[PDB]
Structure formats: structure tokens, C-alpha cells
């Protein structure tokens, strides 16, 4: 390998593991060109996004194929269907891999030579290789034992100038801080219980929300057992991780256990080997959303309330019927102690591989992979109406506006089952002829994927706190789902080679998929790559400065199929989605089926991605200075998609082949070693990435625009034919022909423009990492910065703190009456359009609305700049000197201190979130924004390693 003709990075296990992340990809965040890696939240157990060379799939499948040995590995993700009222993320298929079992990882970034893995490799490949048995001294036992702490990284910046109240006036029950400027006077607050009221000085408490959070804590233990002979090897490992996060109580929980046993034996020409792995996880998630969730409830606190003074439920004023506020929020401590959102998964995956060498040059390889999961979700909420409505202010006292309407309880349970089989039958042929070298490989691939689940839910809990399907007097709901997809393929890979100087590779592959129309199942795709190690023909001296000099170029295609069941019409059990609910059948005793709303097609042709790429790799002076640059031009074409259609056609979407989605880019890596004595070494690394997304055409028959994710009557993110993927549209203030913001003649507040404007896209303009590694004898010090700049992202965290009067921005003008600077009034009778200098102020009374709506930007204000610079990871490691390990059973000892996600610095416009959050998953729709996702976290820990 490294006769490759396209961009590829290789990382060693030691680096993967040194960060001591529970996950294998998240320690690589910001460290590889072209490989964008984010975590959906700092919530223990959450998913990780890995995106290679931008989004090509509009239908939400952009992660690289993970390939463990080399059996493709399930990468499914479990996250909330409804990010708005119940957001939660329970993890990602790859998060199962034990970091300690990784020997090498190699990210294939080119989509031009994928015949060895078929379609799913167009998104990239993460080739993992696991440690095997090795003869060492003495016993073969490595133990790793870690301990880590979480702390909140960044809370929004609050004003501390105005307390509880609204309109500028003091109240005793607000969820916000539009009251008067703090006096230090004593003023009643909260509901009244037993004809008694709480009464405290009216002053800010700027750490109330910060004090709320605990310190996260996590311990881990991994053991491995290792050994080999000249004929065989054997490796067995066990890992274990227990995290309870930053959020008070057990609600934020992740427990992982893995067990692995890999082994091989060679006998004559034949080698057989096997790898079997079991993975168990147990997640608990403190749900996000706009309802009665912890964080929403927590940010809607007046700046003068002591949030930790609310935990003691033996103080009646914190019980739900007397909690100081009634406005769509509850005591955060009650939510986390009495709601339930839990997940458990058991997983088995494995490989069997048999190699047979025959007739000098040939090798036969059979490889079989299995991957099966069963996971179980359990969610409950109490029957707040039965517990607290009658006789309480919050309460019967609020009528139809109480938070308890109609919170009558709910409990559901889902069991999902996934199963993937992969089969590879290959013969390989390798013969040197004179200086040339020939390697041919023809193979068969077969694959079958299957998911199913069954779902049951009861509402209105008889016993208000017990979470069981027996505990309802009303109808249950039951749902069941299965999909099944299959595929076989033949492929061939010819690589030629002259004098270890020219490398040439040809790949061809033809697939038949089950998800394409019967008369059009087969698709074919070739590739071609070239490598030229031109160092090998330099001067004798001139090649004393240039250690290595390679140039590479690839041109190739990768075909792709559709998601399951997109060809034929369907009739669904008839249901009507109305705002904030449904009206579904049966009614009343009658069942009914309705024509499904996505029109299908038997016209569809296969997807086809075409990519060109050139790259250059050079190293100088002992490999003391090194760079790699690559330029790619990739076109995903005819991808099968449910494209929005005018419902008056009778369908809301039609399945067709789109046009081209292009990503072009530069990938630049640069390393150097300013100092390399024998006891000291200093290395510097700089990687740089720029991708340019452009949708080139969406079928114009249906418009040239389809929503990817959007709020009804609010900020939506689209794919539009001329633009990058992820264009946001949002409401903007109307402006007259000379640029001044038109304002209502009576309120003073901005007037809406007739259309939404374009307001940015989801894409970073560039991304880069800078890192340095100090080695002195056996101390090491690593420091890695991650830099993402450009693009925009929706943030309810800003939306709610603006609406709340808590954001520092809202103490503008010291909340004195004000005229929007450079505002006008539009004066129009019938047809004559004229503009006049605005004279109307915005009252004290109405300042809350001005900010609640977003100032002069209106709703576009809650698009925030996704840019950050981050101290991603620091690791301080000390290998203990072998001489101190002589009277010991230990062959080696390394203690290690590390920190992750340590500081984040963002532009001035953004004082609210760490931009590395979402509530809509680890793929495309994730880029829409965060919906009061939990605050991201700062991690730091120790780790002790011991070899036996």
C-alpha cells in the first residue's frame, strides 16, 4: 500500500487511543483533511458525524462505510424523530468499537476506486484493522484504567440588569426577566401556599444557572490478552465505560461493555481466522425540546431566582403545584427525577475468513460477515394532571393555560432488530514479470440488510407514576415496521507496477440491487488511478534533499441504489397530521386506507458519482518536512430522492433522479520536525480543508427547491438549484429602496418583508487543524487546535434567551424607550408608495416583543455564525523508565493526563452556544441547528496503562 492513487490518511492505534475517548472517531476531530468530524452533543452516549468531502446525499446518508476486517460494520444511528418536543440521541453504529482494539485506521477519501466495497464507499471508507496476537514479553496482558470529569464548557451570556417581570414591570410569577432594574429592595415572588409567600431581596444571581450543573464523572476499564506462535495468534479484549454526565442526577447516563475474541491459525497453504464481538450499551438521556424538558425549563428562569434553591421538594413552593412559574415550564429537578428516557442495546458482529494459497501466484479468499442488533427504548412521563391540577395555582388556578394540560401521562416501548450479512468470494493473482509487477483480483460480493421494530404506547396513566402498558384506561397504540434490501455484485481490480516507480490501478464493478425497478437493477462503474514516485529518478544530490516525491491522479465512477420501497404506490392507514396532533383512523370502529403522499416511480435509473482527483506528496530531509495536497472534483448525479411536489398534484413528493450535487475542494497537510535530537523532538502539523458545495440542478418540473428541514412559518433550510446545499431562508425586516428598515407607525416595531430572504448556508468556508507534539525521553505533550469558520446555523438557545430577556443583548439602550435607528414609515394609500422618517418609539412596554422577535433582523437573528476555534485535545503522557520496572511484574507503565473540548472561542456575534450541537442527528438535517440541545462540555481525565 501507498501505491494508492488518491488521498488517504493513516492513524495508528496509539494516537486513536491516547485521547481516551469512549468513541473511536471523536479524538480525530479536526485532525484529518477532508474528514469533518463533529459530536451531536456532549450528552453521554450521543452520536458522531463523520463526513468526507461534503454532503453528496440529500436524503440523509453521508457517513463513510466503516469496514473492520474488512467486513462492513453497521453504522445505524438511534435519535429522536421529533427534535422539537423530545430530542435525544442514543448513539451511532461505530461508537461500539473498542478504541484499544484498533491497530491502524485508514480513511479512504476518494470515490473513484470503490470496486472493493461498492456503492456505500462513495461517501468514503474508514478501514479499521484490529490488533492481533504478537509474541512479546512476557504474558500478553495490557490493562487500561481511566477516570474523567465533565464540566460545562459555555453557557449563554446573560444580562444581570433586569429581574423577574414583564413589560418592564415587576411580577411575582414570570418565566423571564423583563422587570425593573435591580434595587436590592425586598419584593415577593412565587405562588402563594398556605397564605404565605416567599420574599427575598431583588438582586441578580449571575451564577444561578452555572451552579445548577454538577461535575460529570466517568470511569473506564479495559483488559486485553495477547499471544502468538509461528502458525497462529489469539487476541481477547474486554472494555467497560460508565459515564454520569454534567446534568444533575442519573438522567445523563451511558454504560458501555465490549468483549472481543479474534484469532487465526495457518496450516500449510490454508489459513482460517475468525473475529467475534459483543457490545452492550445502556443510555439515559435528559430530553430536549420546547415542552417541559430540563433545559427549556432551565433557561426560562428570571435572572434573580436561585435555581439550586428549587431542588428540595420538601419545600412546598418547589412542588409542581406551587413552582414559582406556570408558563409552559416546570421545576428542572422534577423533570429529571420523574421522567424516563432510556435505551439498551445488545449487539453481536463477527467475521469468518478463509485464505487458500495455490499454484505459486494465486490466493482464494472467502469472507463472511454478520452484524445483528436488538435495541430497546423505554420513555415515560407522569400524569401531571392527576397529580397536581386540582386545588393548586399552577394548577386549577390557570385553567386551560396550565402546564398540566393535557399532560395526562404517557409510556411507550420499542424493540428494534437489525441484521446485516455480507459475503465476499475473491481470488487474487500476483506475479512479478521482469521489473513489472502484476496483481489481479476478481471477486463476488453479496449483501443483505434487514431492520424491523415493533412499538407500543399507552396514554393517560391510571396510576400516575407507574410506567407500564397495563396502566391505562384508554386505547393503546401499536406500530410495527420492517424493511429488507439485498444486493450482489461482481468486481475486478488490476494494479500494475514498474520498478517501484509507476503504479497503475484499474477497477471495474457491476451491482444488482433490490431497491431499483425490476427492469433496471444493474449498474456498472469503473475507475482508474495512477501513482508516479518521481523521486526515484532525481540527481544523486538533488535526491538527498527530497526524501520522497509522489504525484497521483484518479478518475472514476461509483454507482448507487435507492432506499427500500420507493418504486411502487402505497396505501397507508389513513391519518391526518394537524398542527400539534393527529386525527387518525380507526374512527369510530371503521378503518380506512389513504393513497400515500409520496408518488413512486418505475422510471428511476441508478445513481452515479463521478470524481477526478490530483494530489502531490513530498517529504524533505529525513522526512523532517512533509506535505500532501490534493484537489478533487466530485459529481453525485441522479441520486434517488423524494422531491417536494405541490400537494395540489395530489402528492407532496415524487421519487425521481435529481441532477448533480458537486463538491470540489483542496486538502492540504503539512508537517515538520524543527527539532529532533535523541532525547528531544518537536513536531508541528497543519492540515487545511476547503470544500465548495453546489447543487447544480433539481428537476425544474417541480420547482427548483425542496425543503430539507424547516419550521412551519419560520426558519427553513433548503436545497436550491443554484446554491450550496443547506441554504437557510428566514424572515427579514422590510426595507425601502435606500436601505432603511420600514417600521409600523404605531408600535415602533419592524415590519416583515413580503418574502423570506436568503441568510447563509450550512457550509463552513474552510476548516483547519494545527497541532504540536513534544517528546522528551518518555514524556509526551500533544496539543491540537480545531478551526472551523463560515456558514450559519439555527439556535433556539439564542431564541429563548432573547424571548426571555436574559441574553445580554436585550439590555440594549438600558431598556429605555427607543426609535429603531434609521427607521422610516411606509405611507401608501392604494398605489402611491412613500416613506417618511419614523417618529414612533418602541415603548418600555413593548421592548420585550422587539427582542423576542429578534431586533431589526427579525427571525433571521437566530441564525448564528457556526464559526469556532477550539482547543480540541491536550495529552500529557509519561512512559515510566523500564529500569524502574525490574523488581516488578510490569513490562511497561504509562500514566497519562488528557483534556478534550477544553476552550472554545467564537466570533463576537455568538455569545450563546458551542456551535458543535444539534437536535436533528448526525447527518444532513443535523446542520439545521440545535433546539436547546444540552450545553456542550469540557472534559479532562487520567489514564493508567500496565503491560504484563
Amino acid at each position: 500500500e501507498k501505491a494508492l492513487g488518491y488521498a488517504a490518511t493513516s492513524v495508528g492505534g496509539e494516537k486513536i487511543a491516547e485521547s481516551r475517548t469512549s468513541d473511536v472517531m471523536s479524538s480525530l476531530a479536526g485532525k484529518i483533511a477532508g474528514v469533518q468530524i463533529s459530536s451531536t452533543s456532549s450528552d453521554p452516549g450521543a452520536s458522531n458525524s463523520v463526513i468526507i468531502r461534503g454532503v453528496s446525499s440529500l436524503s440523509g446518508t453521508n457517513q463513510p462505510l466503516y469496514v473492520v476486517d474488512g467486513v462492513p460494520l453497521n453504522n445505524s444511528t438511534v435519535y429522536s424523530t421529533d427534535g422539537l418536543n423530545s430530542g435525544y440521541d442514543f448513539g451511532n453504529g461505530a461508537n461500539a468499537i473498542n478504541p484499544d482494539d484498533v491497530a491502524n485506521m485508514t480513511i479512504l477519501k476518494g470515490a473513484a476506486a470503490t470496486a472493493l466495497y461498492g456503492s456505500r464507499a462513495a461517501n468514503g471508507v474508514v478501514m479499521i484493522t484490529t490488533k492481533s496476537g504478537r509474541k512479546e514479553k512476557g504474558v500478553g496482558i495490557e490493562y487500561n484504567g481511566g477516570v474523567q470529569w465533565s464540566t460545562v464548557l459555555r453557557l449563554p451570556e446573560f444580562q444581570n440588569e433586569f429581574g423577574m417581570g414583564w413589560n418592564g414591570n415587576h411580577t411575582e410569577l414570570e418565566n423571564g426577566s423583563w422587570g425593573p432594574r435591580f434595587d436590592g429592595s425586598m419584593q415577593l415572588w412565587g405562588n402563594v401556599y398556605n397564605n404565605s409567600q416567599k420574599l427575598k431581596p431583588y438582586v441578580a444571581m449571575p451564577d444561578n444557572i452555572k451552579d445548577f450543573f454538577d461535575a460529570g464523572f466517568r470511569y473506564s476499564n479495559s483488559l486485553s490478552f495477547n499471544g502468538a506462535t509461528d502458525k497462529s495468534d489469539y487476541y481477547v479484549s474486554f472494555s467497560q465505560i460508565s459515564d454520569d454526565g454534567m446534568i444533575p442526577t442519573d438522567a445523563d447516563s451511558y454504560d458501555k461493555y465490549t468483549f472481543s475474541a479474534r484469532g487465526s491459525h495457518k496450516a500449510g497453504a490454508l489459513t482460517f481466522s475468525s473475529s467475534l464481538n459483543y457490545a452492550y450499551q445502556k443510555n439515559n438521556f435528559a430530553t430536549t425540546g420546547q415542552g417541559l424538558s430540563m433545559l427549556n425549563s432551565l433557561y426560562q428562569t428570571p435572572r434573580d431566582i436561585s435555581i439550586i434553591g428549587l431542588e428540595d421538594q420538601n419545600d412546598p413552593f418547589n412542588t409542581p403545584g406551587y413552582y414559582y412559574t406556570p408558563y409552559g415550564v416546570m421545576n428542572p429537578y422534577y423533570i429529571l427525577n420523574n421522567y424516563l428516557n432510556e435505551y439498551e442495546s445488545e449487539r453481536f458482529y463477527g467475521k469468518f475468513q478463509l485464505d487458500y494459497e495455490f499454484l505459486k501466484y494465486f490466493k482464494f479468499t472467502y469472507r463472511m460477515g454478520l452484524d445483528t442488533t436488538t435495541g430497546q427504548s423505554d420513555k415515560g412521563k407522569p400524569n401531571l394532571y392527576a397529580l397536581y391540577y386540582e386545588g393548586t395555582p399552577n394548577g386549577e388556578g390557570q385553567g386551560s393555560s396550565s402546564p398540566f394540560s393535557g399532560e395526562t401521562g404517557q409510556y411507550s416501548e420499542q424493540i428494534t432488530r437489525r441484521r446485516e450479512i455480507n459475503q465476499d468470494i475473491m481470488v487474487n493473482f500476483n506475479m512479478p514479470v521482469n521489473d513489472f509487477n502484476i496483481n489481479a483480483l476478481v471477486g463476488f460480493n453479496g449483501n443483505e440488510r434487514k431492520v424491523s421494530y415493533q412499538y407500543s404506547e399507552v396514554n393517560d396513566l391510571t396510576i400516575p407514576t407507574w410506567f407500564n402498558l397495563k396502566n391505562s384506561g384508554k386505547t393503546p397504540i401499536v406500530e410495527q415496521h420492517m424493511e429488507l434490501r439485498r444486493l450482489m455484485g461482481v468486481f475486478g481490480q488490476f494494479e500494475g507496477s514498474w520498478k517501484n516507480m509507476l503504479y497503475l490501478t484499474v477497477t471495474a464493478r457491476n451491482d444488482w440491487s433490490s431497491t431499483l425497478p425490476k427492469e433496471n437493477r444493474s449498474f456498472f462503474y469503473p475507475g482508474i488511478t495512477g501513482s508516479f514516485i518521481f523521486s526515484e529518478l532525481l540527481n544523486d544530490n538533488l535526491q538527498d534533499v527530497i526524501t520522497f516525491g509522489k504525484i497521483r491522479a484518479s478518475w472514476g465512477k461509483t454507482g448507487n441504489d435507492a432506499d427500500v420501497y420507493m418504486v411502487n404506490p402505497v396505501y397507508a392507514q389513513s391519518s391526518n397530521r394537524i398542527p400539534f396532533g393527529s386525527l387518525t383512523f380507526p374512527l369510530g370502529g371503521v378503518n380506512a386506507y389513504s393513497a400515500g403522499n409520496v408518488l413512486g416511480s418505475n422510471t428511476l435509473s441508478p445513481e452515479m458519482t463521478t470524481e477526478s482527483e490530483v494530489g502531490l506528496n513530498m517529504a524533505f530531509f529525513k522526512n523532517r518536512l512533509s506535505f500532501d495536497v490534493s484537489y478533487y472534483n466530485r459529481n453525485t448525479d441522479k441520486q434517488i430522492f423524494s422531491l417536494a411536489m405541490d400537494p395540489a398534484s395530489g402528492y407532496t413528493a415524487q421519487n425521481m433522479n435529481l441532477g448533480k450535487i458537486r463538491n470540489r475542494g483542496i486538502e492540504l497537510l503539512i508537517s515538520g520536525t524543527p527539532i529532533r535530537t535523541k532525547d528531544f523532538s518537536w513536531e508541528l502539523t497543519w492540515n487545511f480543508t476547503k470544500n465548495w458545495s453546489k447543487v447544480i440542478s433539481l428537476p425544474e418540473e417541480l420547482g427548483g427547491i425542496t425543503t430539507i428541514y424547516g419550521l412551519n412559518g419560520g426558519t427553513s433550510m433548503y436545497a436550491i438549484t443554484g446554491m450550496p446545499v443547506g441554504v437557510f431562508k428566514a424572515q427579514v425586516a422590510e426595507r425601502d429602496p435606500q436601505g432603511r428598515i420600514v417600521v409600523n407607525s404605531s408600535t415602533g416595531l419592524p415590519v416583515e418583508a413580503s418574502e423570506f430572504g436568503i441568510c447563509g448556508d450550512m457550509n463552513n468556508k474552510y476548516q483547519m487543524g494545527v497541532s504540536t507534539n513534544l517528546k522528551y525521553k518518555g514524556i509526551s505533550l500533544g496539543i491540537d487546535f480545531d478551526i472551523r469558520q463560515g456558514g450559519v446555523m439555527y439556535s433556539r438557545t439564542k431564541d429563548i434567551n432573547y424571548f426571555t430577556g436574559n441574553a445580554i443583548q436585550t439590555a440594549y439602550n438600558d431598556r429605555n424607550p427607543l426609535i429603531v435607528p434609521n427607521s422610516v414609515n411606509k405611507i401608501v394609500n392604494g398605489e402611491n408608495v412613500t416613506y417618511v422618517e419614523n417618529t414612533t418609539p418602541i415603548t418600555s412596554s413593548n421592548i420585550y416583543k422587539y427582542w423576542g422577535d429578534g431586533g431589526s433582523d427579525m427571525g433571521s437573528c437566530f441564525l448564528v455564525d457556526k464559526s469556532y476555534v477550539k482547543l480540541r485535545s491536550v495529552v500529557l503522557g509519561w512512559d515510566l523508565p523500564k529500569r524502574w520496572l525490574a523488581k516488578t511484574p510490569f513490562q511497561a507503565v504509562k500514566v497519562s493526563a488528557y483534556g478534550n473540548n477544553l476552550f472554545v472561542w467564537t466570533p463576537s456575534s455568538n455569545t450563546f452556544i458551542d456551535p458543535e450541537m444539534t437536535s436533528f442527528g448526525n447527518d444532513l438535517e443535523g446542520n439545521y441547528g440545535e433546539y436547546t440541545a444540552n450545553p456542550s462540555s469540557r472534559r479532562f481525565g487520567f489514564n493508567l496503562m500496565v503491560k504484563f
Binding site: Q290, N712, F803
Partner: peptide, 10 residues
């Protein structure tokens, strides 16, 4: 686009 949100209370 689809999904829907509520305003606050005050």
C-alpha cells in the same frame, strides 16, 4: 417545511 413550534408564556 414541516415541524411546528409554540410561543412562550408571559
Amino acid at each position: 417545511g414541516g415541524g411546528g413550534g409554540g410561543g412562550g408564556g408571559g
